[PDB]
């Protein structure tokens, strides 16, 4: 009540007049609310949500009023905005004037003496804030401050000898160094002092860290504030090191400080519990300090370059050894001396003083003055020299030794596998997705690990649930008191194969095992377990139960102690055995015992064996007593990890014009078609334009010149310059024969000039990105691009990748209405057929088979029409012979006569009159009849072209081989989901799958790595990628890829699509700007979010969009819903949010509409929480029930599950009364505002959402109308704007509505009677 | 804990070496040793 | 397999041919290991050390130091030839030259052959 009253008085939104700025408010809030509550998250949230930063803190900030409390408060707010994933920097961008002063004083505060003016926690907050800054260099205001901290001049923080070493190593650097020193002369004394302080900041910050770290005791109690400071510091180090602009010069600085050696010898890492997170962060930092990249060129280092670097280090150490100390070491070959073991052997016996001296000769430490003792520990000195010179394994070898399954040592580690309870207050040992990556390996590995660790979370839930249900009890044996659908007791387990390693690798190439279960279960469960197939992943589990028989289990309690969890290992089904011992017209097995042969992870196997042999650890693989299966659709993690690893191993040949953009650096526009060197001058736009008028209107800024003046002669070809002039050439589609129905289908969509820009771009080489707001015609743009590419570049193959099968259904539906032969279409998938034709491998093989029959019959008819005898039927083979021998000959003779010249001789010598009798010449002009004859030959030739393509079905009997032919050769358009593409990449590459162009839909719904993988479904061609075009269509202003555990979004931004990253990076986009599915009035609720999003003509002009909704005054309303029986939002189960007042009101409105005669199916009900969804459903069944007058809404579901869907009328419940929740994500808002064609009615606590700054552009519109539902119960042909010719009653709350609907219904039950049975 | 003959508190059926748990009605007439010595084959 | 042999000859005519040859050796012989070592002498280093580790595990017997010598292209590979000698003659000296009498080396080879021991002494 204190913070809120202050907000109301001084800064809260929607309060006309506020008290003037008062510095004491900032001082009081910081000391008494923030500091005293120990930086309580709920306090900080309340302040942030109340718009403290935007409305009080920053706009009143100046140098004269700046204080500790002021600085800290700003940083707390910024940090909290990051924790909540809302824009953090907007107010600074609005008033940038005092930010440089503010930033400099954040630096001073961060370096302030430990435990001095600023507490260690306060300086941790500053560490995190600065981390956000370094992670935000895309913001000009921030970058302009950070530049001086991380540029070449920062090297004045280096030891003088190390600086000179670097300048000698890269001689071209010295002139730039000199230039800096010169420009420094031109500075006034204070600007010079400020510059030097900024240049030294990071190196000085490192020293502060090192002293904090050293203050941590080995075993004595330690304050958590020291631990967390050290953790956040390493997080900062990682991010600086993992970004090239911050790494470029700082990497040397970090090395010069020897921080990493300090950290690995520290007491903190030695604390098994306290320092565990610190250790894991440390391992990440080590990965980056030794990362395989050239700091200056930014290029990845080759294996040769790595080896040279390592060899040069040893060489210079031997030079120093020979001249000044280690004689035998200096003369030995590198391989002799460069192992950790050898280095310890050679330098371990030496004194501290000698090691210090050695290090000094390598410019690692200052000279040890004569007769002085070193102040450094011998273990530091030794580890310094050893770690610097020892052999390193490469990043690839490191990756190739990783098991693909999580063990029990990983699954419950919440540092790397956080629960959904993760607040965001501590940090995690996780990769982060933002804008840039160092190299392709960095990029691929971050996605590998994030996918790996996120999938591990779902595994834990699967394990904890199924194993708990089994109720493992002590009997020293185990007895299971319960049963589980997804997990069975193991009856037997035996490793049956341990194969020899490939040359080089130290792990078996293959490990297999037999696992037996006893299906003493319900037949439904027996069937599901027998439903296991090859590549299905199962988990092998060892429990040694802790509880006596009958002991109750508590899911709230630590799972591992509850069931006695000892081991978890993964495996992959090879197949079930049959009674002949064969790995599986599937047989009917007898009895209830089933054995599966499985693959074990060979790396995990070797590690376990090594552990057993070396350390006497028990053999894990003799202990398994539970096997757990999973839902197939949620269980692709292993296959995806494998594919990513394979991609990493390969040379990853992506187009050279894509590589830099993919990594997020370099010119974001360099793949635009206008900058591609192979830009095509002349394009056939075919049926894109409906008329010459449509064409001219499609290029507003251009001058159109037609190659033909006659308006009656005006498909179109367009030539683009290399200057605002377009040359348009009309041309004639080649006659396809004497059957006018064989004229091609044509596009009917009058594309806007913006849609045309997208289509134009998609036809050109390079990267085309299309931002398509709700209903702006993404699909029509897509198929037109596909069609244009199909006709312009017949040889080229197009790969289509979407997120959902729904999008594929939509694409193929529209493709069918265009001039595209269905023999060139193919759809891959692992499904309910929703299109008029079947484009699966099965459907396409069947089409070919049926079409082959019909065409061979045409050849027979042709044979007979020519008077050629022969009763045998044709094959594709003999049809080919027939074409060359009987058809081509006749045609060539004919052309020889009439094309080498009367109208009459065109018809008189035409060799195929009888064949086309069922269908010729007009006798008007030669040119016309000749072309008619030409078209007849094209008709016949097409028959034989198809038969030649179909010969493969005569050479390949099985449907699988036949489908392979379509995939590798016949199809020109191949479509699949990104999911399928990830699973099938290995098979596709092995098949020799090839493609030239990629088009994607739903691009902003697709995970980063699942966007990248479709780039590599083929092998390189002559050393280069065959990929010519990349078209991505999506909407980053709508919902992102789904991350099951939102902790991975909060910390790592794992939901961020490649599409979204590219938009952020600055890749130019084509922004579709005219929607065609909803009222203009409804469009206003979300078009504010987009660039110039208006409406198409038919939305503006058709009556169906201006007709009001019967019985409701407004076509949309926001309806305030106060408490019902003292309750607002409720939570019958944790996080199962509901709102009875809102639910009842929504259902009552739905009933009202049904009783008015609304088509119940045209109404869908949406809400932001699953808890409310089930409750609305509950009320639907319990209030409507067996009511004849009331139907069911098409759907009752969540907004997140209604993406890409719509209905005429949407009833929306926002549920929340205490906190705004995940609707604060504007993308969720936009989706919620755009599901309705004609009617949107929203029920919420209006005050709560009004206060949310991010939601203001929508809710300021919604509150422009009454918050009490306006009904017209005696009502349609009433128009949207006209005053109604009925009574308007105002329902002021839910109970009044539920009353009204009851009375209305009881009046309708007496006056009517309908009859369904 | 043992669950085998090899190895009151147990609250288990345990039969430690060979006390029969199922009906046999065996013919054999018990072999006997007297005091210190002999299997009484007489 | 004859097509694989002719294709192996095509690889012998030659990077892709080197891939076909290395695959031909890794397909899973000591003479063939000498051939793959010759491929290391031609094509292309740590991976060669790994395949050399495979050849070493396959047979710990005296040309292996020469296989290690390709990695030197040498003092380190000679050191591997020396450690291999400890694991077991002139090859270590050749490794020393790489870091940089044949008749006595030959009587030594007679010693290297798998009263006879007295001859080994002489």
From Swiss-Prot, chain A:
Keywords: Acetylation, ATP-binding, Helicase, Hydrolase, mRNA processing, mRNA splicing, Nucleotide-binding, Nucleus, RNA-binding, Spliceosome. Residues 1-394 are annotated as: Helical region with structural similarity to ARM repeat domains. The modification N6-acetyllysine is found at residue 990. Gene3D superfamilies: P-loop containing nucleotide triphosphate hydrolases. It catalyses: ATP + H2O = ADP + phosphate + H(+). GO terms for molecular function: 3'-5' RNA helicase activity; ATP binding; ATP hydrolysis activity; mRNA binding; RNA binding; single-stranded RNA binding. Residues 395-1317 are annotated as: Required for assembly of the IB complex. Changing residue 778 to A: Decreased affinity for ATP and ADP. Loss of RNA helicase activity. Disrupts spliceosomal pre-mRNA splicing and leads to the accumulation of spliceosomal B complexes. Its EC number is 3.6.4.13. GO terms for biological process: mRNA splicing, via spliceosome. It is found in: Nucleus; Nucleus, Nucleoplasm. SUPFAM superfamilies: P-loop containing nucleoside triphosphate hydrolases. It comes from the Eukaryota. It holds the Pfam family Aquarius_N_1st. One of its GO terms (cellular component) is nucleus. InterPro entries: Aquarius_b-barrel (IPR048966), Aquarius_insert (IPR048967), Aquarius_N (IPR032174), CWF11_fam (IPR026300), DNA2/NAM7-like (IPR045055), DNA2/NAM7-like_C (IPR041679), DNA2/NAM7_AAA_11 (IPR041677), P-loop_NTPase (IPR027417). Identified in the spliceosome C complex. Component of the XAB2 complex, a multimeric protein complex composed of XAB2, PRPF19, AQR, ZNF830, ISY1, and PPIE. Identified in a pentameric intron-binding (IB) complex composed of AQR, XAB2, ISY1, ZNF830 and PPIE that is incorporated into the spliceosome as a preassembled complex. The IB complex does not contain PRPF19. Within the spliceosome, interacts with SNRPA1, SF3B1, SF3B3, SF3A1 and SF3A2. Belongs to the CWF11 family. This is RNA helicase aquarius. It comes from Homo sapiens.
UniProtKB/Swiss-Prot annotation, chain C:
This is Pre-mRNA-splicing factor SYF1. It comes from the Eukaryota. Associates with RNA polymerase II, the TCR-specific proteins CKN1/CSA and ERCC6/CSB, and XPA. Identified in the spliceosome C complex. Component of the XAB2 complex, a multimeric protein complex composed of XAB2, PRPF19, AQR, ZNF830, ISY1, and PPIE. Identified in a pentameric intron-binding (IB) complex composed of AQR, XAB2, ISY1, ZNF830 and PPIE that is incorporated into the spliceosome as a preassembled complex. The IB complex does not contain PRPF19. It is found in: Nucleus. The chain holds residues 286 to 428 of 855 of the full protein. HAT repeats lie at residues 74-104. Belongs to the crooked-neck family. Involved in pre-mRNA splicing as component of the spliceosome. Involved in transcription-coupled repair (TCR), transcription and pre-mRNA splicing. The gene is XAB2.
């Amino acid at each position: 009540e204190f913070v809120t009253q202050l907000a109301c008085k001084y800064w809260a939104p929607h309060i006309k007049k506020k008290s003037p700025f008062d510095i004491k408010v900032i001082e009081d809030i910081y000391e008494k609310e923030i500091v005293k509550s120990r930086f309580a998250i709920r306090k900080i949230m309340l302040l942030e949500f109340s718009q403290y930063l935007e409305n009080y803190l920053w706009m009143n900030y100046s140098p004269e009023v700046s204080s500790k409390a002021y600085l800290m408060s700003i940083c707390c707010m910024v940090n909290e905005k990051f924790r909540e994933n809302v824009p953090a920097w907007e107010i600074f961008k609005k008033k940038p004037d005092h930010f440089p002063f503010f930033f400099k004083h954040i630096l001073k505060a961060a370096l302030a003496e430990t435990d001095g003016e600023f507490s260690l926690h306060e300086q941790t907050v500053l560490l995190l804030f600065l981390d956000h800054c370094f992670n935000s260099l895309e913001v000009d205001l921030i970058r302009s401050q950070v530049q001086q901290l991380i540029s070449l001049p920062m090297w004045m923080g280096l030891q003088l000898a190390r600086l000179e070493l670097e300048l000698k190593k890269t001689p071209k650097l010295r002139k730039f160094w000199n230039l800096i020193k010169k420009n420094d002369e031109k500075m006034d004394p204070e600007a010079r002092e400020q510059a030097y302080q900024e240049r030294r900041f990071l190196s000085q910050l490192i020293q502060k860290f090192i002293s904090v770290l050293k203050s941590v005791p080995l075993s004595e109690p330690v304050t958590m504030d020291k631990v967390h400071y050290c953790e956040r510091f390493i997080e900062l180090m990682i991010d600086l090191e993992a970004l090239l602009p911050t790494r470029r010069w700082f990497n040397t600085i970090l090395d010069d400080s020897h921080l990493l050696v300090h950290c690995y010898l520290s007491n903190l890492v030695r604390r098994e519990e306290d320092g565990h997170l610190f250790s894991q962060l440390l391992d990440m930092l080590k990965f980056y300090t030794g990362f395989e990249i050239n700091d200056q060129t930014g290029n990845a280092l080759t294996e040769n370059e790595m080896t040279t670097i390592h060899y040069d280090r040893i060489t210079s150490l031997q030079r120093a050894a020979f001249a000044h100390f280690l004689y035998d070491f200096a003369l030995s070959n590198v391989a002799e001396v460069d192992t950790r073991e050898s280095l310890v052997k050679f330098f371990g016996p030496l004194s501290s003083n000698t090691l210090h001296q050695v290090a000094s000769y390598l410019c690692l430490l200052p000279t040890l003055p004569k007769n002085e003792d070193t102040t450094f520990d011998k273990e530091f000195l030794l580890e310094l020299l050893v770690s610097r010179h020892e052999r390193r394994i490469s990043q690839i070898q490191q990756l190739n030794q990783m098991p693909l399954y999580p063990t029990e040592k990983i699954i419950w580690d919440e540092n790397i596998v956080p629960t959904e309870y993760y607040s965001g207050e501590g940090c995690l040992a996780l990769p982060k997705l933002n804008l840039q990556f160092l190299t392709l390996h960095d990029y691929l590995l971050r996605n590998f690990n994030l996918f790996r660790l996120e999938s591990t979370y779902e595994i834990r839930q699967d394990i904890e649930d199924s194993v708990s249900r089994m109720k493992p009890w002590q009997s020293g044996g185990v007895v299971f008191g319960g049963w589980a659908r997804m997990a069975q007791p193991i009856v037997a387990f035996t490793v049956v194969e341990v194969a020899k390693p490939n040359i080089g690798e130290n792990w078996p190439t293959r490990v297999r095992a037999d696992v037996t279960i006893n299906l003493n279960v319900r037949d439904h469960i027996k069937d599901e377990w027998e439903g296991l197939r090859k590549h299905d992943v199962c988990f092998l589990i060892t429990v040694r139960p802790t509880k006596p028989y009958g002991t109750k289990f508590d899911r709230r309690r630590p799972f591992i102690e509850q069931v006695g969890l000892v081991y978890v290992r993964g495996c992959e089904i090879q197949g079930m055995l049959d009674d002949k011992g064969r790995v599986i017209p599937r047989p009917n097995l007898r009895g209830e015992s089933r054995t599966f042969r499985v693959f074990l992870d060979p790396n995990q196997y070797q590690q376990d064996m090594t552990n057993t042999i070396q350390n006497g650890a028990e053999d894990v693989y003799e202990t398994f007593n539970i096997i757990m299966r999973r839902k197939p659709k949620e269980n692709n993690f292993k296959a995806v990890l494998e594919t990513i690893r394979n991609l990493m191993n390969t040379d990853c040949v992506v187009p050279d014009w894509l590589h830099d953009i993919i990594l997020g650096y370099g010119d974001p526009s360099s793949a635009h078609y206008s900058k591609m060197p192979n830009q095509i001058a002349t394009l056939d736009f075919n049926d894109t334009f409906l008329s010459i008028e449509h064409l001219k209107a499609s290029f507003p800024g251009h001058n159109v010149k037609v190659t033909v003046e006659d308006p009656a002669l005006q498909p179109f070809r367009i030539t683009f310059p290399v200057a605002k002039t377009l040359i348009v050439e009309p041309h004639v589609i080649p006659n396809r024969g004497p059957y006018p129905y064989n004229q091609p289908k044509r596009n009917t969509i009058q594309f806007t000039h913006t849609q045309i820009e997208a289509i134009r771009a998609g036809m050109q080489p390079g990267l085309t990105m299309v931002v398509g707001p709700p209903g702006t015609g993404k699909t029509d743009v897509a198929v037109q691009i596909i069609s244009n590419i199909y006709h312009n570049f017949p040889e080229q193959r197009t790969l289509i990748v979407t997120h959902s099968n729904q999008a594929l259904n939509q694409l193929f539906e529209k493709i069918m209405a265009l001039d595209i032969d269905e023999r060139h279409l193919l759809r891959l998938g692992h499904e309910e057929l929703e299109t008029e034709k079947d484009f699966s491998r099965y459907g396409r093989v069947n089409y070919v088979l049926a079409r082959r029959i019909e065409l061979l019959e045409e050849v027979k008819r042709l044979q007979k029409s020519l008077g050629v005898p022969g009763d045998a039927s044709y094959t594709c083979e003999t049809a080919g012979y027939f074409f060359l021998y009987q058809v081509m000959s006749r045609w060539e003779e004919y052309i020889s006569k009439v094309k080498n010249p009367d109208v009459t001789e065109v018809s008189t010598f035409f060799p195929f009159h009888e064949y086309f009798a069922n269908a010729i010449f007009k006798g008007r002009s030669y040119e016309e009849d000749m072309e008619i004859a030409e078209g007849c030959f094209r008709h016949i030739k097409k028959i034989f072209t198809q038969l030649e393509e179909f010969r493969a079905s005569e050479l390949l009997r099985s449907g699988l081989d036949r489908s392979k032919y379509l995939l590798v050769k016949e199809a020109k358009i191949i479509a699949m989901t990104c999911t399928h593409a990830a699973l099938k990449r290995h098979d596709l590459v092995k098949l020799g799958f090839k493609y030239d162009n990629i088009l994607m839909e739903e691009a902003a719904q697709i995970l980063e790595i699942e966007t990248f993988i479709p780039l590599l479904l083929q092998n390189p061609q002559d050393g280069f990628s065959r990929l010519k075009r990349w078209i991505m269509i999506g909407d980053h202003h709508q919902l992102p890829p789904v991350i099951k555990n939102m902790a991975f979004q909060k910390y790592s931004n794992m939901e961020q699509s490649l599409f979204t990253r590219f938009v952020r990076v600055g890749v130019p986009t084509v922004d579709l700007d005219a929607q065609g599915r909803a009222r203009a009035s409804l469009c206003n609720l979300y078009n504010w979010r987009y660039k110039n999003l208006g409406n198409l003509p038919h939305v503006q002009l058709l009556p169906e969009f201006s007709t009001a909704n019967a019985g409701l005054l407004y076509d949309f309303q926001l309806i305030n819903v106060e408490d019902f029986q003292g309750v607002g939002e409720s939570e019958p189960n944790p996080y199962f949010y509901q709102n009875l007042g809102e639910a009842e009101y929504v259902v009552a409105l739905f009933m009202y509409m049904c009783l008015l005669g609304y088509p119940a199916d045209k109404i869908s009900i949406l809400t932001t929480y699953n808890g409310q969804k089930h409750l609305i459903r509950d009320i639907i069944n319990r209030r409507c029930g067996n009511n004849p007058l009331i139907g069911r809404p098409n759907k009752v579901t969540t907004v997140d599950r209604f993406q890409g869907q719509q209905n005429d009328y949407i009833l929306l419940s926002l549920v929340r009364t205490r906190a705004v929740g995940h609707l604060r994500d504007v993308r969720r808002l936009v989706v919620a505002m755009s599901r309705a064609r004609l009617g949107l009615y929203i029920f919420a606590r209006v005050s709560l959402f009004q206060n949310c700054f991010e939601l203001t552009p929508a809710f300021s519109q919604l509150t422009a109308r009454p918050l009490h539902l306006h009904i017209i119960p005696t009502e349609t042909t009433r128009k949207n704007g006209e005053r109604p010719s009925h009574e308007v009653q105002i329902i002021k709350n839910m109970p009044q509505m539920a009353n009204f609907v009851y009375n209305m219904y009881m009046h309708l039950i007496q006056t009517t009677h309908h009859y369904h049975q | 804990i043992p669950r085998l003959l090899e190895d009151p508190e147990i609250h288990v059926a345990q039969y430690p070496l060979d006390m029969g748990r199922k009906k046999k009605m065996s013919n054999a007439l018990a072999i006997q040793v007297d005091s210190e010595g002999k299997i009484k084959y007489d | 397999v004859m097509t694989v042999r002719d294709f192996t000859q095509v690889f012998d005519s030659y990077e892709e041919s080197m891939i076909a040859a290395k695959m031909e050796t890794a397909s899973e012989e000591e003479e063939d290991d000498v051939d793959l070592e010759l491929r290391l002498a031609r094509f292309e280093l740590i991976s060669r050390r790994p395949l050399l580790l495979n050849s070493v595990l396959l047979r710990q017997n005296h040309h292996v130091h020469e296989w290690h010598k390709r990695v030197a292209l040498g003092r380190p590979r000679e050191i591997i030839n020396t450690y291999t000698e400890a694991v077991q003659p002139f090859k270590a000296t050749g490794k020393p030259h790489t870091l940089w009498f044949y008749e006595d080396n030959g009587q030594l080879d007679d010693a290297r052959v798998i009263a006879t021991k007295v001859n080994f002494k002489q």
